[PDB]
Amino acid sequence: MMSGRPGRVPLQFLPNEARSLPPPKLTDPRLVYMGFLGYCSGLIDNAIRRRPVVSAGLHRQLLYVTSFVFFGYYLLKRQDYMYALRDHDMFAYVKSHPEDFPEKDKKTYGEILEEFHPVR
Amino acid sequence: MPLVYMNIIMAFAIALAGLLMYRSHLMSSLLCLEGMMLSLFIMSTLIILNTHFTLANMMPIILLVFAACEAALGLSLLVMVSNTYGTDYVQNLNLLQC
């Protein structure tokens, strides 16, 4: 869309000014979903290999959950960064082109007609 | 756009048609497959020489060079067809009907 913004050094997963945002908390509902997906991978892995899925090795599943939790948190910051960026430059633009977005005057519903359509 | 450029441009257009409009023998397409890049090579040299784009004299050689690997790839596949059917005829090139 983003791609081509000023100061957009490529192949960067987290530019420095992105750290000026509130980092996601470890109990983030989005983050815990990342952990849930990792756990579901552990069950599939044992099911694929014909193993006792519920407790077929606590090492394989532990890596599955941790890896997904890890990759989620970094993805969340970049997620949080871009959305913050998307709204940020808008506010700079919205004050940079005042004439394009003129505030329409406010008239209460005591004036506006709505030509009520009866139902029968 | 000068006439010489037009002549090469149409030269490919018949070459593109020549390769696309196919014939029984698969050899002839392979001649026309790399024939079409010869016009590409020829005209490419024309612009760079005309425009004095000294560094872009890079392209005419390397363009042909990888076109050669394709031709080298070309008949190498062709001999396998000839080693399985006897002739490179493309109407028998339909074993993948199903």
């Binding site: 290999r49 014909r50 407790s55 077929a56 090795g57 | -």
Partner: protein, 320 residues
């Protein structure tokens, strides 16, 4: 690990292990023609890993305890049943052969894997190339039908193509009156019920087709049963030859990586043995197949992957 790419990359070859005592021996013959004993004699004389003749429960004697399983649970066919009833409706005749061909085919894969991992020759009885003589002979008297043959040889071409032919074949020649008189001496009540017609068909199929069809793939070492008794004679000229015929004395480590890829994957060697050709004698509907498979599941060991069965006693499931 096994020949998996990493092992090949680190320099592990297979021609390095191969020696002069690296050949496939098919010591065949006739029905109970004494070839089984000759198999052991040849094996122990030149130190080849002997493989007992493939049967119905051979695959059962490969996995787990290496012990025979229930006929219903493994094979569903019975050679004794075919021996007693020649032409039944349950389809034991053809289903016995096709399961037999698969069991021999698995035996061939185990034989090649041992040879390709040790460089030591292997001797086998009734190689999978021989198998077609029985089935066609069973068709001669009517044990199976025309439509039966189409499934078997279809499996034959799609499977036996990649496996290399043997190097040595020992046809123990025993004539028909001797066999038709010796089967009384065995005494096992199932094999008395053998028709001379079924016998007469198996030998003529052997000499006329089994030896010639693969003669160009390896030399024919014809041996009368009299020659079979003198194991000292047959052991000289197996060494007196080279077996230049066939493609085996041409292969290199390039093909050997492919060969040990397939034989190591036991599922791959017989993945094509289950061709979806819906022949009535082998097609099992969902209801019977589901119940039988469910019976296979809660059997010991088979519940999980090998080494992952707590019922047997595999501790550390929570870690392994």
């Amino acid at each position: 690990l096994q020949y998996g790419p990493l092992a090949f990359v680190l320099g592990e070859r297979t021609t390095r292990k191969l020696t002069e005592t690296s050949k496939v021996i098919t010591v065949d013959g006739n029905i109970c023609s004494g070839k089984g004993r000759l198999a052991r004699e040849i094996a122990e004389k030149l130190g080849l890993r002997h493989f007992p003749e493939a049967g119905i429960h051979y695959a059962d004697s490969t996995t787990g305890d290496g012990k025979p399983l229930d006929v219903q649970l493994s094979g569903n066919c019975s050679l004794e049943k075919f021996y007693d009833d020649p032409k039944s409706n349950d389809g034991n005749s053809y289903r016995l052969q096709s399961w037999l061909y698969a069991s021999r085919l698995l035996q061939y894969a185990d034989a090649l894997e041992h040879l390709l991992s040790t460089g030591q020759g292997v001797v086998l009885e009734r190689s999978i190339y021989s198998d077609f003589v029985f089935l066609e002979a069973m068709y001669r008297q009517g044990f199976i039908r025309k439509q039966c043959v189409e499934h078997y040889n279809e499996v034959k071409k799609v499977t036996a193509c990649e496996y290399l032919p043997p190097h040595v074949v020992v046809y123990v020649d025993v004539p028909v009156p001797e066999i038709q008189s010796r089967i009384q001496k065995k005494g096992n009540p199932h094999e008395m019920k053998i028709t001379a017609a079924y016998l007469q068909d198996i030998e003529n199929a052997y000499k006329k087709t089994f030896l010639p069809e693969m003669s160009e793939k390896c030399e024919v070492l014809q041996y009368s049963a009299r020659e079979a008794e003198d194991a000292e004679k047959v052991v000289e000229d197996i060494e007196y030859l080279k077996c230049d015929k066939g493609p085996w004395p041409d292969q290199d480590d390039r093909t050997f990586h492919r060969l040990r890829m397939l034989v190591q994957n036991k599922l791959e060697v017989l993945n094509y043995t289950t061709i979806p050709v819906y022949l009535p004698e082998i097609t099992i509907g969902a209801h019977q197949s589901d119940r039988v498979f469910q019976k296979f599941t809660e059997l010991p060991g088979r519940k999980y992957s090998p080494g992952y069965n707590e019922d047997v006693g595999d501790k550390w499931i929570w870690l392994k």
